[PDB]
Amino acid sequence: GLTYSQLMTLKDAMLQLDPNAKTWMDIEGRPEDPVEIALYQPSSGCYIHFFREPTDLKQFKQDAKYSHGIDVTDLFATQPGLTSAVIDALPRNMVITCQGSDDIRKLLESQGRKDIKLIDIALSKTDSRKYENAVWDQYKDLCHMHTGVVVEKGKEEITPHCALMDCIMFDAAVSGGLNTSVLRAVLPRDMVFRTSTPRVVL
Numbered sequence: 001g002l003t004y005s006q007l008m009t010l011k012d013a014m015l016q017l018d019p020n021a022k023t024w025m026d027i028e029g030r031p032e033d034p035v036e037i038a039l040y041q042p043s044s045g046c047y048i049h050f051f052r053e054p055t056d057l058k059q060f061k062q063d064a065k066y067s068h069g070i071d072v073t074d075l076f077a078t079q080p081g082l083t084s085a086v087i088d089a090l091p092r093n094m095v096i097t098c099q100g101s102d103d104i105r106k107l108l109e110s111q112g113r114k115d116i117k118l119i120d121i122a123l124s125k126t127d128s129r130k131y132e133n134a135v136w137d138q139y140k141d142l143c144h145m146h147t148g149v150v151v152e153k154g155k156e157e158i159t160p161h162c163a164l165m166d167c168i169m170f171d172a173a174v175s176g177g178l179n180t181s182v183l184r185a186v187l188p189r190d191m192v193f194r195t196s197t198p199r200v201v202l
């Protein structure tokens, strides 16, 4: 769980979202056990992005091989309870656009956010991954957490799925290109991860 000071820091951070602007949301991992969560407002450029340690390591390993390619050891330092804290702090009656709403539905509903409405924009495999190369080429420095080799079931190597890149590239398909806004993280780096570097005299 988050400290009281962090919860107040989160609330002030969540204020940067426009409750009536177009907001994308995508997750990696199943809604009952998500490991990467991203929200994206292309108008203001704000984006929410954080990670979570998985509960089902067996399901995580299969999800890593065929989807996100995340090393589980990179998730040991994630802030616990951050998923519930961020979902609790989302603006009320917000409308969220997503590709595949039924799992975004399960996640938000498990946290009691029935006020949030979902727009299930569905796209082809061609349209959803249309700007995949352009988005990764432009924003690869926003997520270095996809270190494993991902294959698609014969098996051949594909580009790993990132919840943040998915939001950007799905919006790129609908809007027909990359948005000109400069992307800015809403969540502080020290709220997403807990520092593993001990204070040492040198």
Ligand SMILES: [Zn+2]
Pocket: 036, 143, 144, 145, 146, 161, 162, 163, 164, 165
């Ligand atoms: Zn990612």
